[PDB]
Design a protein around this ligand. Structure first.
Ligand SMILES: OC[C@H]1O[C@@H](O[C@@H]2[C@@H](O)[C@H](O[C@@H]3[C@@H](O)[C@H](O[C@@H]4[C@@H](O)[C@H](O)O[C@H](CO)[C@H]4O)O[C@H](CO)[C@H]3O)O[C@H](CO)[C@H]2O)[C@H](O)[C@@H](O)[C@@H]1O
Ligand SMILES: OC[C@H]1O[C@@H](O)[C@H](O)[C@@H](O)[C@@H]1O
Length: 549
């Protein structure tokens, strides 16, 4: 019974090079979206191919900006896509929930400013000049994620604490701070941790670029890249990229209105999903149990699970590409928010894996919300390529109980790969890995700030719960470029035994680990298990470990 394609709706603004009032108009969204951290408004600015002049697209909360060509240079700005921190007094550590993709940029002073923190991906971009990742004045910042991009000149992180870059091309990298990690990046600074703190891998073992809306001439369509093993450099610049096109008309177009039963019925029926920029309350989980289903969000499209249900469940099928969505906890506790595969699933998905890309989870912050576990990854071979799983530390509806969320991510399948894993503030283990031969490239954690007292975070004989816990049974794991920080702002007497916990086996390895106390609010006793120096002083110097075991 459902109906494919049709109309993307008001919240998706489709600019062209003869379109009137682009500056003034891109400027109204920012005005309302600049300081709008928890609003329900959602926007995507989409630009048709061509060259656009005298422009500076300033990007606020819940704003995605993109070109609608196939290769990034089809849509060129003699101008800038700018993220700054004027609204929060130079501090960029709340510059969340926005994105830029599939544009070239010829920045007006020779350098584009993308001063963001978490959940602010920069994908499929060509910067014909510099890329400055810090707010004007080298004030605080906690990014960040760049993939499938070419920066002609220098990337300058400056004050950025940490960063992940994959499968890209840079002609310079200026500096590290705590953890600037690279995989498959031509031009990456040579590996050197802790000095500078560069963790560098030549290729990404597998990656698959995120699907995106484009105009194959007159028609709305989505292009869906195929996977690369040992990816290095960009995917677009040599000629005809690799992967499929879907016509629009083979997508259900979800808008304000949609029930979860119709969304699933459209996937029953053989349609893909395109979530328009909106907030979707669902009282049954969204279910994708058809191989190769693309589920693509625009304008930070957001799902909220009502009645304590799970928001999104992927079945044990090959090739599901979930991209560009925020799952936002309801006030009724959900046992899970996202499940990838059913519990127990023992099959392969190796040739054609399921992935989550730019999938973000929030618990609290916009009022009261809670979940026991946020993401369960049951399916073997799953790719998690950019996720921010975040128990709110600030905002409305936040308490050590009021927005309690015990567990962030739990990985149970085998062969699972996370590139750009950001997980923070959970009451217990932020990340748990139970499956075999897991790989994590780049991890950023901060522990819960609102732990009341030592006794509240006790873990048998461990003080605190690891930010990242590989199970005792696991025989095979390997991780690179991983940091956990603490700011026990309620009770800075607290001690966190470690950032990491894992068995001591010849084939469970870690490379370039660090923990950091933020201005002496709590301290780490060790880095991993019982190994590594404690943090000390209020000077926020990392305690580091190059190699383990
Ligand atoms: O609070 C809400 C959000 O905050 C996120 O965590 C922040 C955290 O980012 C912040 O850390 C700062 C660091 O940014 C800072 O690094 C320095 C660099 O700025 C500088 O250029 O280089 C040196 C190193 O040589 C560093 O000085 O260092 C100060 C310490 O002096 C840190 O405090 O601290 C905030 C709280 O104090 C903290 O909240 C968090 O990830 C988000 O989840 C959260 O929503
Ligand atoms: O308009 C040009 C300038 O605008 C502002 C940004 O912060 C700068 O990086 C940019 O060069």
């Amino acid at each position: 019974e459902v109906v494919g394609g049709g109309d993307l709706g008001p919240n998706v603004l489709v600019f062209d090079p003869s379109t009137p009032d682009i500056q003034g108009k891109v400027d109204e969204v920012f005005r309302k979206q600049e300081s709008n951290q928890f609003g329900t408004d959602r926007y995507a600015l989409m630009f048709k191919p061509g060259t656009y002049n005298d422009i500076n697209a300033q990007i606020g909360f819940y704003t995605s900006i993109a070109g609608l060509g196939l290769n990034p240079d089809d849509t060129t700005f003699n101008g800038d896509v700018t993220v700054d921190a004027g609204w929060f007094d130079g501090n960029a550590t709340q510059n969340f929930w926005r994105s830029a993709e599939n544009l070239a940029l010829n920045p007006v002073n020779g350098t584009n400013r993308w001063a963001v923190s978490q959940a602010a991906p920069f994908r499929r971009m060509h910067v014909k000049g510099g890329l400055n990742l810090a707010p004007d004045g080298y004030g605080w910042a906690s990014g960040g994620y760049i993939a499938d991009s070419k920066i002609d000149g220098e990337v300058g992180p400056y004050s950025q604490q940490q960063w992940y870059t994959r499968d890209s091309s840079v002609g310079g990298w200026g500096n590290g701070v705590w953890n600037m990690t690279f995989s498959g990046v031509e031009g990456a600074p040579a590996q050197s941790f802790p000095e500078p703190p560069y963790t560098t891998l030549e290729t990404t073992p597998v990656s698959r670029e995120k699907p995106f809306l484009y105009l194959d001439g007159d028609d709305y369509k989505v292009f869906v890249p195929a996977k690369r093993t040992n990816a290095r450099g960009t995917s677009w610049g040599n000629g005809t990229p690799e992967g499929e096109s879907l016509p629009l008309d083979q997508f259900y177009v979800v808008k304000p209105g949609a029930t979860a039963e119709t969304i699933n019925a459209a996937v029953d029926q053989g349609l893909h999903l395109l979530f328009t920029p909106g907030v979707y309350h669902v009282d049954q989980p969204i279910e994708i149990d058809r191989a190769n289903t693309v589920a693509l969000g625009l304008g930070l499209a957001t799902i909220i699970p009502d009645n304590g249900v799970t928001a999104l469940k992927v079945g044990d099928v090959d090739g599901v590409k979930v991209a560009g969505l925020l799952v936002d906890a309801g006030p009724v506790n959900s046992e899970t928010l996202v499940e990838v595969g059913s519990d127990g699933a023992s099959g392969d998905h190796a040739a054609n894996p399921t992935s989550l890309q730019d999938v973000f989870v929030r618990i609290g912050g916009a009022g009261p919300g809670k979940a026991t576990t946020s993401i369960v990854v049951n399916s073997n071979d799953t790719i998690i390529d950019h996720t921010w799983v975040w128990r709110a530390d600030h905002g409305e509806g936040v308490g050590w109980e009021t927005n309690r969320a015990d567990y962030g991510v739990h990985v149970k399948g085998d062969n699972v790969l996370a590139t750009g894993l950001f997980v923070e503030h959970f009451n217990k283990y932020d990340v748990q890995w139970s499956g075999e031969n897991g790989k994590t490239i780049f991890y950023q954690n901060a522990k819960a700030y609102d732990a009341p007292d030592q006794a509240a975070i006790q873990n048998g004989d461990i003080k605190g719960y690891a930010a990242y816990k590989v199970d005792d049974s696991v025989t095979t794991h390997e991780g690179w470029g991983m940091g956990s920080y603490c700011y026990f702002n309620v009770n800075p007497d607290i001690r966190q035994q470690h950032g990491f916990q894992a068995p001591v086996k010849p084939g469970v390895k870690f490379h370039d680990l660090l923990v950091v106390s933020l201005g002496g609010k709590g301290q780490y006793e060790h880095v991993i298990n019982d190994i590594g120096d404690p943090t000390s002083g209020d000077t926020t110097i990392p305690s580091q470990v190059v190699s383990f075991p």
